[PDB]
């Protein structure tokens, strides 16, 4: 792996702890998250606040990563998240591509393309 692909894979491992505070340590201050095509969450404060809000209605019970790659500086990775809506207990398998930008071993950009088919 690249040092950047390694970082991304630890972050992917980390997701299942559903810990926004644990997760935001991977992100630089100058950073953003965009759950496509939704408008981005800008800055570290917002990404955290985004993870937190996500962790109050869902648990990530599992992440199965089945691809990791890189081109032109960006790490590309593909996974299936096993999502469990906490107010129901129902579980959902959904695919998602994660596109990461890193500057000096910290996340400066993160775009998710969840599978959005009916």
């Amino acid at each position: 792996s690249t040092p950047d692909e390694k970082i991304v894979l630890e972050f992917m491992d980390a997701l299942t702890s559903n810990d926004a505070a644990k997760l935001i340590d991977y992100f630089a201050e100058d950073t953003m998250y965009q759950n496509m095509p939704l408008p981005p969450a800008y800055g570290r404060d917002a990404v955290e606040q985004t993870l937190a809000g996500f962790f109050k209605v869902f648990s990530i019970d599992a992440v199965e990563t089945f691809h990791i790659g890189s081109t032109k500086g960006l790490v590309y990775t593909e996974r299936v998240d096993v999502l469990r809506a906490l107010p129901t207990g129902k579980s959902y398998n959904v695919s998602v591509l994660g596109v990461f930008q890193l500057t000096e071993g910290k996340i400066t950009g993160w775009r998710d393309y969840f599978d959005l088919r009916e």
Copy 2:
């Protein structure tokens, strides 16, 4: 219009209030909201919390409805929402079809299909 299309058009007008309590009175207790393809919000409390949660990061500055109709007992309407993200001030126009199920003049089912192109 039908009495059912009438109720939906009023609800549509009430949206710009950005007020969940105002909005929630259109829904029966046995009801649901589903932002496709996301899992539904089950029951009236959950629809309430979902709007309120939406009204903390966005304002609905304008609903421009350009279509309303009905088939099989369900009301279909189409609009463009002008969305302003509260943490940034940036505005966005997005289209969405609304599919409504009513029982005795109250909403028992609401599904949104927002335009999800990149």
